[PDB]
Symmetry: C2
Subunit: 294 residues, 2 copies
Amino acid sequence: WMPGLRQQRITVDDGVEINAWVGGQGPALLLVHGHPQTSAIWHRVAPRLAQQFTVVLADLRGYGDSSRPAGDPEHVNYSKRTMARDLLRLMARLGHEHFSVLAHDRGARVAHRLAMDYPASVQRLVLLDIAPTLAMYEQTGEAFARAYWHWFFLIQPAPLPERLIEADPAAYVREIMGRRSAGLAPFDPRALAEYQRCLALPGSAHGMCEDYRASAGIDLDHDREDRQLGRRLSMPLLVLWGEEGVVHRCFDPLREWQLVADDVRGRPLACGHYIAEEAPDALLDAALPFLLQA
Amino acid sequence: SHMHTDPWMPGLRQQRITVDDGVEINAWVGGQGPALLLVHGHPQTSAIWHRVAPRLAQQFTVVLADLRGYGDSSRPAGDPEHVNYSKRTMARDLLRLMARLGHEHFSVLAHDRGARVAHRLAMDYPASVQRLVLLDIAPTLAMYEQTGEAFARAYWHWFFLIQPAPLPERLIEADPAAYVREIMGRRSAGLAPFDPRALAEYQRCLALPGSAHGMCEDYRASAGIDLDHDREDRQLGRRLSMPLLVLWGEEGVVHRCFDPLREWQLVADDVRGRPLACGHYIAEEAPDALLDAALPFLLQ
């Protein structure tokens, strides 16, 4: 489990600490998970990556063992701008002013904003099973709303979605993850246990829901401003999504990324949403060449 | 408008009628004149009609029915295909209810889930339904087919309550009173527009054991088998033959996200309708406007 990596906490905001697993050697590589998971998602690929990169597997705020800050009416505290600043400062305090990013689900969205807000810090970008949040909400149809129901449940005003999550957090993890195409088969027991332990920490439900609420509000304002002003990702971008997942069925991922990024390459993989755990070898085959030419 | 002093169901008596095997329908029956079935929706009960029923009972024999899974009616088990709470089954419930009360031909005033039941009822038994008034709905099939960002944001439950058990049930049963308060109150005036007795009824009845699963089964059917039946009607060119009046709230989601009159014209041959200056809960927010618009239609 995480051979060669040691867990570290770095204060990134006033009363906000980010928990991360740091190890390896070489150029810096920030690994960012999504919902409802933690840095543990990277346990199958992190050893290999650590042979040529200094890997930093970060737990987003509200997730894992990081701080669980309070929400706020406009959802600034869990905006992608704020969470991206969390990760920028994390890498800075660990001595990495320039780094690559490998990200999944919520993390990838954070990474997107990070790469727009601080382009000089992000060398390369690899985003897993996402299309841009703004396009995904704008292009919502019946199929997407049925499958990604949480994108419309978790954004509802507190305390509703929190009631659901906290009534039975372990059941929440199991139903969110096992009702997708691959079921619960691809998840290592230790990893599932981590997701459930961390999801149960106090304040987690509200933090996750605040992330979603911002991504249905203020985050879309920031993304729309970028769109209207012609501001796009400048650095090399690799986008990988699961052929068996909702993103593949309901959107044109590569097209959507070409609209908001200038140097984009990507393709589907023979798996579902949870790429790093369902298809770690395919993920590495597709991403190591790209991240190593950086 | 609503006052603690207003009468509660004056002239009506509560009745339980067996309409299916182990399924009884609770209903308030009263009045004089031609028969009129009143059908509520979610997350409420027959109590929703308490503002308009005293007046209506002056010219109709009114039957305010509690849907199965709702109010004081039975809460039968679900099933993998969601037949037990399909709109076909609930419509047959109401047909049999009116039959056992001695009414083979009747008019219908219905809201929300009840209106959807009414749609199916009027399609499956057109000779029994004389006139139809449907409140703040467009047809379920068009509403799902035309889902966009705004609709999914506003009618989030249409995509939460349909998820496989036990998830939405967990939400509802963790705090049923909060579910009612949050579902109904999310607007500028909150729960003020609902008479205290009516809100108390909705909360008491939703808290009865088995309620969450029944309501979720209704929604699941409306995202599955019900849509099979409705698409079959559309493909075969079967439409509502009797007069249809559709009234929806100008301030509600249906108005914002669809063209209700057009959508009903696609599935009915004799339709008229218009928005009212209120939200979703027409019968409680604007009882006088509701009656002004509907009594002429129901009396012809």
